[PDB]
Paper text:
Very recently, using next-generation sequencing technologies, a novel B-ALL oncogenic driver DUX4/IGH, derived from the insertion of chromosome fragments containing DUX4 gene into the IGH locus, has been reported in ~7% of B-ALL patients. In order to investigate how DUX4/DUX4 fusions recognize DNA, we have determined the crystal structures of Apo-DUX4HD2 and DNADRE-bound complex at the resolutions of 1.5 and 2.6 Å, respectively.
The Apo structure is a classic homeobox fold with three α-helices, termed α1, α2, α3, respectively. The N-terminal α1, α2 helices are anti-parallel. The α3 helix is perpendicular to the axis of α1/α2 helices.
Numbering used by the authors: 5 to 54
Amino acid sequence: AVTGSQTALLLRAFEKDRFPGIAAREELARETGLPESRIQIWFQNRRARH
């Protein structure tokens, strides 16, 4: 699971760039302190639900 702060940051990103490319995902990884693969999973999962 990701933290509340990470969720808030990722959701705001998702609502501006719904399909981040690898550079954007690596940047979100650095912003959040999450691995890039975890960023990708989070976006894939959210899009599969929406």
